[PDB]
Symmetry: C2
Subunit: 159 residues, 2 copies
């Protein structure tokens, strides 16, 4: 049952984004599969994270964040931002609006103000209102499913 | 900018689930691309929906709901549950635990109790604690991206 729940989400595919935050001068960021649209007017999105993430204190104590949509050419960056090594070592980012860390060469990004976090024991829902953004290079979205990075192939359609 | 936000989520792929609820005897349900894992202990998931959904009153006023993970063989059911026709016309479901409508032949389902909804002007975040579930037939997950149902193909790996 702990099993059934973990299993069913193993079977649920997801798109891959990266969240960035500048916590009093130091950049933090992390790969995320829970980013979802919430509303259009005003524009908002949500994601979930663990309060044990190395980035939780940055998120708890900061207002502006970035979200980055990833394509297939961004798989290395996705893996970077999911592992424990220093994620900002390299020339792959720079500070943008509100001093949010902006990652180069992504499908596009949005900058938001965190409205609130809804915190449970070990995880939180984060609600963000979007204040800025920029479309990047169009490409094929990056997906993650049962532990592997994947690409979407549309299903046959006669049209 | 209304554009940039709508565009960036066009570029963000997603897995496809269906949410079902029994509102005082009548089944309601809807296809959803925002279902995400929140926590493991206790097990919880989140999704977002529009307060103008035909299913909002069911969700606002009911506690038990079902979520169904979909495979490629479930594309017709996904489309059913996204369109305005009577979604429960046919022999493709039955009442399960807590009288939740359970859809047949899916990748698996979970039953949850809605803890709360966080309601904005036109949309809400719904937080659900999982109380029951069952793995269905393993298969390939269904994805939805820029208006089309897709399948995930893993990216090449030398291993």
């Amino acid at each position: 049952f702990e099993g059934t729940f973990k299993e069913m989400f193993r079977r649920h595919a997801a798109g891959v984004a990266i969240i960035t935050v500048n916590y009093n001068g130091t950049p933090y960021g992390f790969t995320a599969t829970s980013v979802a649209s919430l509303s259009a007017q005003p524009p908002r999105f949500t994601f979930n994270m663990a309060r044990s993430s190395s980035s939780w204190p940055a998120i708890a104590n900061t207002t502006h964040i970035g979200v980055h949509m990833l394509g297939l050419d961004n798989q290395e960056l996705a893996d970077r931002f999911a592992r424990t090594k220093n994620r900002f070592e390299g020339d792959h980012w720079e500070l943008g609006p509100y001093e949010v860390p902006i990652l180069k060469d992504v499908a596009g990004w949005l900058i938001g103000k965190i409205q609130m976090r809804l915190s449970f024991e070990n995880n939180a829902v984060v609600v963000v209102e979007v204040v800025e953004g920029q479309v990047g290079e169009d490409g094929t979205p990056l997906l993650y499913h049962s532990g592997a990075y994947s690409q979407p192939v549309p299903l046959d359609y006669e049209i």
